[PDB]
Amino acid sequence: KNIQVVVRCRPFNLAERKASAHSIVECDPVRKEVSVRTGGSSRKTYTFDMVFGASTKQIDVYRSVVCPILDEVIMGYNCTIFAYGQTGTGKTFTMEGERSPNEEYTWEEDPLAGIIPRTLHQIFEKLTDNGTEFSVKVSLLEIYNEELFDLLNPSSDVSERLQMFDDPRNKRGVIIKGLEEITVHNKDEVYQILEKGAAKRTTAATLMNAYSSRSHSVFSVTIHMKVKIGKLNLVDLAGSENIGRINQSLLTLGRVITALVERTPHVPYRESKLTRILQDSLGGRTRTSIIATISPASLNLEETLSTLEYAHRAKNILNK
Ligand SMILES: Nc1ncnc2c1ncn2[C@@H]1O[C@H](COP(=O)(O)OP(=O)(O)O)[C@@H](O)[C@H]1O
Ligand SMILES: Cc1ccc2c(c1C)CN(C(=O)N(C)C)C[C@@H]2c1cccc(O)c1
Ligand SMILES: [Mg+2]
């Protein structure tokens, strides 16, 4: 029912003790509280479904948040996970992850691997000896300036925008004409698909201003089981400093959440590509979770509070 919201604070980064700044964030995992030093000894505290402190490692996030959700997907449910927060707090780090330096590990064992890679690898492990018969297909579409880009098409230039239509076989669904859905036959072909995505994104960046920060990345994985059909959408949202208290999809997401939370009969899903595509994840029939990433630096006070207030109110959304 209620959408689950969790907070994840990134740890300090070298140049983060330079420009004068102290950790104004205190996370308490057992009490599921995040406390912020707002004083200029005053503070604001918020309780979430889960709170992960700066020391939280990727494996901890997967085990605690992802595994449970993946089991749901394998059961035939639709699930979505959002990463929301200002640029620089770890949205991509959490959803995608990074490669450890000096080629110390292969992708499947990289402790810095994020949610997407771990999920893909685990699907094959969990569905290997049990019942059996299943197929996995992934797609990675990114939204920038209300235009859709396919980061997985090999036979197309990343700059070819995609067009979406309402799904005549739906009502709340849309069709993304030309979207590449790649079949992942086995764990051994997962990484190359990610590298391909990584490459096309690099190209998109040279073409579009502040691309990686303003873009909304939607990595979807659909599992056909033999029956049952489960879909997991992993969404790395545009930086929240892109709104506040330009980016039509971000603005609309916030308005959609506001409408859902106040119980207003009209929810503006159609006012943006992002909300039309993810309509069923917002007060729909999909199980939704939001991971609000924040910074410990006193310099990010304002954005951190904004993010916490935004995510906190989101816990009042009911999906089904
Ligand atoms: N939990 C984390 N642990 C270690 N480094 C992190 C974490 N989250 C973010 N970082 C670092 O902070 C910087 C920005 O992370 P990034 O994922 O790009 O944020 P965002 O996607 O929200 O813009 C990079 O150095 C990234 O490795
Ligand atoms: C959609 C997606 C998901 C995850 C990830 C990338 C992309 C595009 C790109 N990455 C890459 O570094 N490349 C080069 C694919 C980072 C990353 C990842 C994958 C595997 C293991 C790991 O430790 C980090
Ligand atoms: Mg990012």
Short mmCIF file of C-alpha atoms and ligand atoms in Angstrom, two decimals:
data_model
loop_
_atom_site.label_atom_id
_atom_site.label_comp_id
_atom_site.label_asym_id
_atom_site.label_seq_id
_atom_site.Cartn_x
_atom_site.Cartn_y
_atom_site.Cartn_z
CA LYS A 1 0.00 0.00 0.00
CA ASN A 2 1.77 3.14 1.21
CA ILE A 3 4.79 3.97 -0.91
CA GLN A 4 7.96 3.25 1.06
CA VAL A 5 10.51 5.99 1.51
CA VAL A 6 14.07 5.63 2.71
CA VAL A 7 16.89 8.14 3.11
CA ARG A 8 20.52 7.65 2.20
CA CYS A 9 23.24 10.10 3.20
CA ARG A 10 26.48 10.06 1.25
CA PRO A 11 29.77 10.29 3.14
CA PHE A 12 32.11 13.29 2.87
CA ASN A 13 34.46 13.60 -0.14
CA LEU A 14 38.07 14.85 0.39
CA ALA A 15 37.39 18.35 -0.86
CA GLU A 16 34.62 18.22 1.73
CA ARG A 17 36.55 19.45 4.72
CA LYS A 18 38.14 22.19 2.63
CA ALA A 19 35.44 24.82 2.06
CA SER A 20 34.54 24.80 5.76
CA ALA A 21 31.63 22.48 6.54
CA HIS A 22 30.69 20.06 9.34
CA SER A 23 28.31 17.10 9.27
CA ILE A 24 24.91 18.53 10.08
CA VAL A 25 23.16 15.21 9.51
CA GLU A 26 22.60 12.46 12.07
CA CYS A 27 21.03 9.21 10.91
CA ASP A 28 19.60 6.68 13.35
CA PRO A 29 18.88 3.32 11.57
CA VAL A 30 17.18 1.65 14.55
CA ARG A 31 14.88 4.60 15.09
CA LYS A 32 14.59 5.25 11.37
CA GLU A 33 15.19 8.93 11.98
CA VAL A 34 17.33 11.52 10.25
CA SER A 35 18.20 14.61 12.27
CA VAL A 36 19.44 17.84 10.72
CA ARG A 37 21.38 20.62 12.46
CA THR A 38 19.50 23.60 11.01
CA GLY A 39 20.76 26.02 13.61
CA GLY A 40 22.43 29.25 12.64
CA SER A 41 21.73 23.82 18.59
CA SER A 42 18.37 23.58 16.81
CA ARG A 43 17.35 20.78 14.48
CA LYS A 44 14.65 19.07 12.46
CA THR A 45 14.08 15.33 12.58
CA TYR A 46 12.10 13.07 10.26
CA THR A 47 11.16 9.41 10.48
CA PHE A 48 11.21 7.25 7.36
CA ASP A 49 10.50 3.64 6.51
CA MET A 50 14.29 3.25 6.54
CA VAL A 51 17.35 5.45 7.02
CA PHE A 52 20.84 4.60 5.79
CA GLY A 53 23.80 6.56 7.08
CA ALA A 54 26.97 7.69 5.35
CA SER A 55 28.64 4.37 6.21
CA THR A 56 25.97 2.38 4.37
CA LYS A 57 27.53 0.25 1.63
CA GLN A 58 25.95 -0.85 -1.68
CA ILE A 59 25.43 -4.45 -0.51
CA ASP A 60 23.57 -3.12 2.54
CA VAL A 61 21.16 -1.19 0.30
CA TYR A 62 20.53 -4.18 -1.95
CA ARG A 63 19.98 -6.67 0.87
CA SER A 64 17.68 -4.37 2.81
CA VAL A 65 15.76 -2.66 0.05
CA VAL A 66 16.21 -4.41 -3.27
CA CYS A 67 16.13 -8.14 -2.48
CA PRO A 68 12.62 -7.84 -0.95
CA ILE A 69 11.38 -5.89 -3.96
CA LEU A 70 12.95 -8.27 -6.49
CA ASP A 71 11.18 -11.21 -4.83
CA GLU A 72 7.95 -9.25 -5.45
CA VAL A 73 8.83 -8.76 -9.10
CA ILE A 74 9.51 -12.47 -9.51
CA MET A 75 6.04 -13.12 -8.08
CA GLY A 76 4.49 -11.21 -10.94
CA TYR A 77 4.12 -7.73 -9.42
CA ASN A 78 5.21 -4.47 -11.04
CA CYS A 79 7.72 -2.56 -8.92
CA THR A 80 9.44 0.80 -9.16
CA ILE A 81 12.29 2.41 -7.27
CA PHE A 82 13.00 6.15 -7.46
CA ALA A 83 16.21 7.96 -6.50
CA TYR A 84 15.45 11.59 -5.58
CA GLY A 85 17.83 14.29 -4.37
CA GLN A 86 20.12 17.12 -5.41
CA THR A 87 22.91 16.59 -7.91
CA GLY A 88 25.96 15.28 -6.07
CA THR A 89 24.24 13.31 -3.29
CA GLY A 90 24.44 9.86 -4.86
CA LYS A 91 21.32 9.17 -6.95
CA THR A 92 23.28 7.51 -9.75
CA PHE A 93 25.74 5.98 -7.29
CA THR A 94 22.84 4.19 -5.61
CA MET A 95 20.85 3.17 -8.70
CA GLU A 96 23.77 2.30 -10.98
CA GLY A 97 26.98 2.37 -8.96
CA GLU A 98 30.59 2.69 -10.10
CA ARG A 99 33.59 0.50 -10.90
CA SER A 100 36.26 0.07 -8.25
CA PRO A 101 39.64 1.51 -9.42
CA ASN A 102 42.62 -0.33 -10.90
CA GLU A 103 40.42 -3.12 -12.26
CA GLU A 104 40.40 -4.82 -8.86
CA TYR A 105 37.07 -6.59 -9.43
CA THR A 106 34.91 -7.93 -12.22
CA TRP A 107 31.49 -6.23 -12.43
CA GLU A 108 29.53 -8.99 -10.70
CA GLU A 109 31.65 -8.67 -7.53
CA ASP A 110 32.40 -4.96 -7.54
CA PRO A 111 31.43 -3.68 -4.08
CA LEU A 112 30.65 -0.33 -5.75
CA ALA A 113 28.10 -1.86 -8.11
CA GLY A 114 24.69 -0.27 -7.56
CA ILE A 115 21.11 -1.54 -7.68
CA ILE A 116 20.70 -2.17 -11.43
CA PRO A 117 23.75 -4.43 -11.96
CA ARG A 118 23.14 -6.38 -8.75
CA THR A 119 19.48 -6.87 -9.65
CA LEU A 120 20.24 -8.23 -13.11
CA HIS A 121 22.85 -10.62 -11.77
CA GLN A 122 20.55 -11.85 -8.99
CA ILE A 123 17.62 -12.57 -11.27
CA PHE A 124 19.65 -15.29 -12.99
CA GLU A 125 20.78 -16.79 -9.69
CA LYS A 126 17.34 -16.89 -8.14
CA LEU A 127 15.72 -18.38 -11.25
CA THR A 128 18.35 -20.98 -12.00
CA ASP A 129 17.35 -24.30 -10.36
CA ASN A 130 13.83 -23.65 -8.96
CA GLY A 131 10.86 -23.99 -11.27
CA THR A 132 12.44 -22.61 -14.47
CA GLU A 133 11.72 -21.03 -17.87
CA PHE A 134 12.01 -17.25 -17.95
CA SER A 135 13.30 -14.45 -20.14
CA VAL A 136 14.73 -11.05 -19.22
CA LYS A 137 14.57 -7.92 -21.36
CA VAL A 138 15.93 -4.50 -20.46
CA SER A 139 15.47 -1.00 -21.84
CA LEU A 140 17.09 2.28 -20.85
CA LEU A 141 15.28 5.42 -21.84
CA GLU A 142 16.27 8.86 -20.68
CA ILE A 143 14.15 11.98 -20.67
CA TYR A 144 15.79 15.35 -21.26
CA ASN A 145 13.92 18.61 -21.97
CA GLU A 146 10.77 16.46 -22.42
CA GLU A 147 12.36 14.43 -25.21
CA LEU A 148 13.01 10.67 -25.07
CA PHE A 149 16.35 9.05 -25.80
CA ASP A 150 17.07 5.35 -26.21
CA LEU A 151 20.46 4.56 -24.70
CA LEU A 152 20.36 0.91 -25.76
CA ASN A 153 19.73 1.03 -29.49
CA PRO A 154 22.85 -0.09 -31.40
CA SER A 155 21.34 0.62 -34.79
CA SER A 156 20.56 4.21 -33.90
CA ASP A 157 22.23 7.50 -32.94
CA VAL A 158 21.50 8.43 -29.30
CA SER A 159 20.28 11.77 -30.68
CA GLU A 160 17.26 10.22 -32.44
CA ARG A 161 14.33 11.13 -30.20
CA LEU A 162 11.51 8.66 -29.58
CA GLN A 163 7.80 9.44 -29.78
CA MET A 164 5.24 8.15 -27.26
CA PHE A 165 1.56 7.37 -27.72
CA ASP A 166 -1.30 6.34 -25.48
CA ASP A 167 -1.64 2.56 -25.48
CA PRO A 168 -4.98 1.77 -27.13
CA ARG A 169 -4.79 -1.51 -25.21
CA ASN A 170 -4.37 0.49 -22.01
CA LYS A 171 -5.79 3.69 -20.53
CA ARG A 172 -2.98 4.55 -18.15
CA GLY A 173 -0.30 3.10 -20.39
CA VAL A 174 1.72 4.58 -23.23
CA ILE A 175 3.73 3.17 -26.11
CA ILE A 176 7.27 4.33 -26.77
CA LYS A 177 7.63 3.81 -30.49
CA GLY A 178 11.07 2.48 -31.35
CA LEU A 179 12.26 1.70 -27.82
CA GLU A 180 14.91 -1.02 -27.85
CA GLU A 181 14.12 -3.92 -25.54
CA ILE A 182 17.21 -6.10 -25.17
CA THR A 183 16.95 -9.79 -24.31
CA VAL A 184 19.46 -10.74 -21.62
CA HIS A 185 20.03 -14.43 -22.26
CA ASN A 186 22.41 -14.97 -19.34
CA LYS A 187 24.40 -13.09 -16.69
CA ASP A 188 27.36 -13.10 -19.07
CA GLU A 189 25.80 -10.57 -21.44
CA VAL A 190 24.62 -8.07 -18.83
CA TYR A 191 27.77 -5.99 -18.54
CA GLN A 192 28.29 -5.27 -22.24
CA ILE A 193 24.74 -3.91 -22.38
CA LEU A 194 25.62 -1.56 -19.54
CA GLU A 195 28.82 -0.47 -21.27
CA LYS A 196 26.79 0.27 -24.41
CA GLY A 197 24.42 2.35 -22.34
CA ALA A 198 27.35 4.12 -20.71
CA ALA A 199 28.85 4.94 -24.11
CA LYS A 200 25.71 6.43 -25.60
CA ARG A 201 25.21 8.53 -22.50
CA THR A 202 28.68 9.98 -22.96
CA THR A 203 27.62 11.03 -26.45
CA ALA A 204 24.37 12.53 -25.19
CA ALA A 205 26.38 14.69 -22.78
CA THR A 206 28.36 16.34 -25.60
CA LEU A 207 25.06 17.11 -27.32
CA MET A 208 23.00 18.34 -24.39
CA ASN A 209 23.83 20.86 -21.67
CA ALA A 210 24.19 19.52 -18.11
CA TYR A 211 22.70 16.30 -19.49
CA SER A 212 23.46 13.84 -16.71
CA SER A 213 22.15 16.20 -14.07
CA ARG A 214 18.93 17.32 -15.82
CA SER A 215 18.06 13.93 -17.34
CA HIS A 216 15.64 11.35 -15.91
CA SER A 217 16.98 7.83 -16.42
CA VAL A 218 14.50 4.94 -16.57
CA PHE A 219 16.11 1.51 -16.59
CA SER A 220 13.44 -1.16 -16.88
CA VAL A 221 13.69 -4.91 -16.55
CA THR A 222 10.81 -7.16 -17.55
CA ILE A 223 10.82 -10.81 -16.54
CA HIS A 224 8.65 -13.30 -18.42
CA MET A 225 8.30 -16.43 -16.32
CA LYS A 226 7.07 -19.84 -17.46
CA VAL A 227 3.52 -17.97 -16.32
CA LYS A 228 3.79 -14.62 -14.53
CA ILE A 229 5.23 -11.35 -15.78
CA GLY A 230 7.12 -8.97 -13.55
CA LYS A 231 8.51 -5.54 -14.36
CA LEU A 232 10.93 -3.49 -12.30
CA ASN A 233 11.55 0.15 -13.14
CA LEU A 234 14.70 1.75 -11.73
CA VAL A 235 14.47 5.53 -11.98
CA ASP A 236 17.37 7.93 -11.41
CA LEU A 237 15.58 11.30 -11.37
CA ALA A 238 16.92 14.68 -12.51
CA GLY A 239 18.66 16.61 -9.71
CA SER A 240 16.08 18.09 -7.34
CA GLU A 241 17.86 21.41 -7.30
CA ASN A 242 16.03 21.45 -10.66
CA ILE A 243 12.81 22.35 -8.81
CA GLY A 244 12.39 24.10 -5.44
CA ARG A 245 9.88 24.28 -2.59
CA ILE A 246 12.75 24.31 -16.77
CA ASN A 247 12.28 20.60 -15.94
CA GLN A 248 8.66 19.80 -16.79
CA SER A 249 8.91 16.17 -15.72
CA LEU A 250 10.41 17.02 -12.33
CA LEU A 251 7.88 19.80 -11.77
CA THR A 252 5.04 17.46 -12.69
CA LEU A 253 6.26 14.59 -10.49
CA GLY A 254 6.10 16.96 -7.55
CA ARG A 255 2.64 18.17 -8.51
CA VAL A 256 1.45 14.60 -9.01
CA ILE A 257 2.70 13.69 -5.54
CA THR A 258 1.05 16.76 -4.06
CA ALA A 259 -2.30 15.85 -5.67
CA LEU A 260 -2.06 12.23 -4.53
CA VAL A 261 -1.17 13.28 -0.96
CA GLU A 262 -4.00 15.81 -0.66
CA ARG A 263 -6.48 13.36 -2.28
CA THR A 264 -7.33 15.74 -5.12
CA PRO A 265 -9.52 13.99 -7.75
CA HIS A 266 -7.36 15.43 -10.54
CA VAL A 267 -3.77 14.17 -10.64
CA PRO A 268 -1.77 15.78 -13.54
CA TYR A 269 -0.04 12.64 -14.88
CA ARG A 270 -0.44 13.86 -18.45
CA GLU A 271 1.45 17.12 -17.91
CA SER A 272 4.81 15.37 -18.47
CA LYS A 273 6.54 12.47 -20.22
CA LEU A 274 7.91 11.11 -16.93
CA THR A 275 4.54 10.98 -15.15
CA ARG A 276 2.72 9.51 -18.17
CA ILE A 277 5.29 6.76 -18.48
CA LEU A 278 5.37 6.04 -14.72
CA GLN A 279 1.69 6.73 -14.05
CA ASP A 280 1.07 3.33 -12.40
CA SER A 281 3.97 3.88 -10.00
CA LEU A 282 2.33 6.94 -8.48
CA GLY A 283 -0.81 5.90 -6.63
CA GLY A 284 -1.28 3.06 -9.07
CA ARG A 285 -1.00 -0.71 -8.84
CA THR A 286 2.80 -0.83 -8.84
CA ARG A 287 4.75 -1.25 -5.58
CA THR A 288 6.76 1.93 -5.23
CA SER A 289 9.75 2.89 -3.13
CA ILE A 290 11.65 6.18 -3.09
CA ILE A 291 15.27 6.54 -2.05
CA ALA A 292 15.99 10.13 -1.06
CA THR A 293 19.73 10.78 -1.18
CA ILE A 294 21.14 13.64 0.87
CA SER A 295 24.41 15.36 1.72
CA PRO A 296 26.05 15.65 5.16
CA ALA A 297 27.68 19.01 4.31
CA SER A 298 26.40 22.13 6.07
CA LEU A 299 26.65 23.90 2.71
CA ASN A 300 23.81 21.72 1.39
CA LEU A 301 21.54 22.49 4.33
CA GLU A 302 18.76 24.11 2.30
CA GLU A 303 18.62 21.40 -0.36
CA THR A 304 18.87 18.63 2.22
CA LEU A 305 15.87 19.96 4.13
CA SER A 306 13.96 20.48 0.89
CA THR A 307 14.67 16.89 -0.13
CA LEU A 308 13.71 15.48 3.30
CA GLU A 309 10.43 17.44 3.36
CA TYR A 310 9.63 16.33 -0.21
CA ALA A 311 10.30 12.66 0.48
CA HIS A 312 8.61 12.72 3.88
CA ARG A 313 5.29 13.89 2.48
CA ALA A 314 5.57 11.19 -0.19
CA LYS A 315 5.09 8.46 2.41
CA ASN A 316 1.38 9.35 2.40
CA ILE A 317 0.81 7.98 -1.09
CA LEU A 318 -1.26 4.81 -1.41
CA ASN A 319 -0.61 2.42 -4.31
CA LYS A 320 -2.41 -0.88 -4.81
N1 LIG B 1 27.23 6.43 -0.71
C1 LIG B 1 28.25 6.90 -1.41
N2 LIG B 1 29.49 6.42 -1.07
C2 LIG B 1 30.67 6.87 -1.63
N3 LIG B 1 30.56 7.86 -2.57
C3 LIG B 1 29.32 8.35 -2.94
C4 LIG B 1 28.07 7.89 -2.39
N4 LIG B 1 27.06 8.59 -2.99
C5 LIG B 1 27.67 9.45 -3.83
N5 LIG B 1 29.02 9.34 -3.83
C6 LIG B 1 29.93 10.22 -4.54
O1 LIG B 1 29.50 11.55 -4.65
C7 LIG B 1 29.74 11.99 -5.99
C8 LIG B 1 28.40 12.10 -6.71
O2 LIG B 1 27.56 10.91 -6.75
P1 LIG B 1 26.48 10.83 -7.87
O3 LIG B 1 25.96 9.43 -7.94
O4 LIG B 1 26.98 11.33 -9.12
O5 LIG B 1 25.33 11.75 -7.42
P2 LIG B 1 24.08 12.21 -8.21
O6 LIG B 1 23.81 11.11 -9.14
O7 LIG B 1 22.93 12.42 -7.28
O8 LIG B 1 24.40 13.44 -8.96
C9 LIG B 1 30.68 10.96 -6.67
O9 LIG B 1 31.99 11.10 -6.17
C10 LIG B 1 30.05 9.73 -6.00
O10 LIG B 1 30.95 8.56 -6.00
C1 LIG B 2 22.72 1.39 -16.37
C2 LIG B 2 23.97 1.17 -15.60
C3 LIG B 2 23.94 0.47 -14.35
C4 LIG B 2 25.14 0.35 -13.59
C5 LIG B 2 26.35 0.91 -14.12
C6 LIG B 2 26.37 1.57 -15.39
C7 LIG B 2 25.18 1.72 -16.13
C8 LIG B 2 25.21 2.42 -17.41
C9 LIG B 2 27.63 2.06 -16.01
N1 LIG B 2 28.84 1.70 -15.33
C10 LIG B 2 30.04 1.49 -15.94
O1 LIG B 2 31.08 1.85 -15.39
N2 LIG B 2 30.10 0.88 -17.17
C11 LIG B 2 31.33 1.15 -17.91
C12 LIG B 2 29.11 0.00 -17.80
C13 LIG B 2 28.70 1.87 -13.89
C14 LIG B 2 27.72 0.75 -13.53
C15 LIG B 2 28.25 -0.54 -13.02
C16 LIG B 2 27.96 -1.79 -13.72
C17 LIG B 2 28.40 -3.07 -13.25
C18 LIG B 2 29.18 -3.07 -12.05
C19 LIG B 2 29.52 -1.84 -11.35
O2 LIG B 2 30.29 -1.92 -10.21
C20 LIG B 2 29.05 -0.54 -11.82
MG MG B 3 23.45 11.33 -11.29
#
